[PDB]
């Protein structure tokens, strides 16, 4: 299809994966597991489950950002996720291994709930996918609900399990566009 | 060739280049999504070539680069178009209206997605025709 006789549309697609050594990238695989590459080896898993993995209502965050950064880049990524959520509670550990946090979606029926907040942030950092369990109306930015009660964010040992979607840099960059 | 991207930077593609007019236009024009991606590609390239170390992806370095290189509004507008069921672009693909004899490539436009699927040249017919007129005007 040539416009004005001579103009063709080429369509180029980017190797977003090429950026893995300088900036985090987000890819969704199946409907319960989504993740962030945090390099050419190490990753970060985001799981949608109904399992109470973390019962540590009191999270032992003392020295979390100071004495032992298992992965300082990773702790920074996890912290920005939290910080971009508007307004409430979380359970977590991060002592030794178990470098993870659990967000519980709990509500007694309106928009602007705690669940809506975590889901918006989650969706944005996993944007370009994450339409899964997108239980929301059109344009209703603050009415987004999901099917699962828990979101667990935890350290992984791999960079390569990407199918279904593409490891886009947009998610993390958007997360921090404050 | 302006900023040429190799087969290791483009997905399932060989190396691609374009005339310098387009890079000059990228640097002068504002709110073009592909320009932010180019800045990230060059940033990545240099960051590793200079670093030469396992101490990769320092978050503080990338955050500062992002503040310097990335337009936060392009990201937010695109996310709001998504919530509003308005076609929006992810950055995997771009449209490159290109003159086939001169190799004159326009600034890449992003390729909008509707209900999880790409829109046709039909949907972009107006944008395509307008860019073709602009390319002619600039060439003359």
């Amino acid at each position, epitope marked *: 299809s040539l416009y004005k006789g001579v103009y063709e549309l080429q369509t180029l697609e980017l190797n977003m994966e090429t950026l893995n050594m300088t900036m985090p990238l987000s890819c969704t695989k199946n*409907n319960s597991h989504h993740y962030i590459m945090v390099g050419n080896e190490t990753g970060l898993e985001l799981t949608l489950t109904n399992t109470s993995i973390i019962n540590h209502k009191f999270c032992n965050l003392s020295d979390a950002h100071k004495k032992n950064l298992y992965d300082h880049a990773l702790m920074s990524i996890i912290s920005t996720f939290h910080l971009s959520i508007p307004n409430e509670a979380m359970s977590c550990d991060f002592n030794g291994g178990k470098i993870s946090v659990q967000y519980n979606l709990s509500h007694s029926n309106h928009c602007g709930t705690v669940a809506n907040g975590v889901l918006q942030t989650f969706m944005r950092m996993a944007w370009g996918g994450s339409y*899964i*369990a*997108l239980d929301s*109306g*059109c344009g209703n930015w603050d009415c987004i609900m999901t*099917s699962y009660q828990y979101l667990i964010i935890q350290n992984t040992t791999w960079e390569d399990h990407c199918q279904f979607s593409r490891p886009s840099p947009i998610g993390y960059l958007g997360l921090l566009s404050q | 060739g302006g900023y040429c991207l190799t087969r290791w930077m483009l997905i399932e593609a060989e190396l691609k280049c374009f005339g310098n007019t387009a890079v000059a236009k990228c640097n002068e024009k504002h709110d073009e999504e592909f320009c932010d991606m180019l800045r990230l590609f060059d940033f990545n390239k240099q960051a590793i070539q200079r670093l030469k170390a396992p101490a990769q992806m320092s978050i503080q370095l990338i955050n500062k680069a992002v503040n310097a290189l990335i337009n936060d509004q392009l990201i937010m507008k695109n996310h709001l178009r998504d919530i509003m069921c308005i076609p929006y672009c992810n950055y995997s693909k771009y449209w490159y209206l290109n003159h086939t004899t001169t190799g004159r490539t326009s600034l890449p436009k992003c390729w909008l997605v509707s*209900n*999880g699927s790409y829109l046709n040249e039909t949907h972009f017919s107006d944008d395509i025709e307008q860019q073709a007129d602009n390319m002619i005007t600039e060439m003359l």
Partner: antibody, heavy 122, light 107 residues
């Protein structure tokens, strides 16, 4: 409950509008009205579905060529079919739904109340 | 697309009958589900839904389970009065128009 009307025999190369009426529970603007058919002796298939805030099509790839949209009053919903043929003979049913998930990616999960079926012969 | 256990199904009164369904693609969410039955001449009755929950007071005898693409149904202490054509439903709209099974006849 859900009550049916508008059934009976029609001629081929024709049209027929089927009707479902709300009883007790009036209709909201949500996707709470949905329709299916089955030829006698055959299993059930989807014809289309109904959302009341704005006219939505929701038709089966098959159904969409002969099945038009609907009127959605607070108690009465009307389904217009056109270009009907003998093969369209079936018992038709109005079902209340909480079935549709509403993000752009629409999903089918949990039908609830069924109306009596109505027999339509073409 | 959905498939189902063969149509010529029967059982003695008491005990169980084996009923099953399978999709071509995993369901959007494995906790989405609808099992129902139709006695001839009757409108459909929902039995089991979502994460194998019983609907509307139907007998506790109705059981089922599954995930992904494959789910099952069985009914304890089957009665002659449970004879019905048994069905599965659910699916994604983009994936299929058939969101109902064909039906298996259970005597």
């Amino acid at each position: 409950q859900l009550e049916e009307s508008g059934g009976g025999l029609v001629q081929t190369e024709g049209s027929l509008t089927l009707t479902c009426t709300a009883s007790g529970f009036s209709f909201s603007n949500n996707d709470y009205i949905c329709w299916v058919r089955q030829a006698p002796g055959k299993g059930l298939e989807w014809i289309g579905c109904i959302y009341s805030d704005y006219g939505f099509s929701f038709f089966a790839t098959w159904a969409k060529d002969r099945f038009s949209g609907s009127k959605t009053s607070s108690t009465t919903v009307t389904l217009q079919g056109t270009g009907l043929t003998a093969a369209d003979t079936a018992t038709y049913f109005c079902v209340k739904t909480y079935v549709s998930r509403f993000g752009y990616y629409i999903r089918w999960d949990y039908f609830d109340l069924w109306g009596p079926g109505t027999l339509v012969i073409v | 697309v959905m498939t189902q256990t063969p149509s010529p199904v029967s059982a003695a009164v008491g005990g169980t009958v084996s009923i099953s369904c399978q999709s071509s693609k995993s369901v959007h969410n494995e906790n989405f589900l609808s099992w129902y039955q139709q006695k001839p001449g009757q409108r459909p009755k929902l039995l089991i839904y979502r994460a194998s929950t019983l609907a509307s007071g139907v007998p506790s005898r109705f059981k089922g389970s599954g995930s992904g693409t494959q789910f099952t149904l069985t009914i304890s202490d089957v009665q002659c009065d449970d004879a019905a054509t048994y069905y599965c439903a659910g699916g994604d709209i983009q994936s299929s128009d058939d969101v109902f099974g064909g039906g298996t006849e259970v005597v």
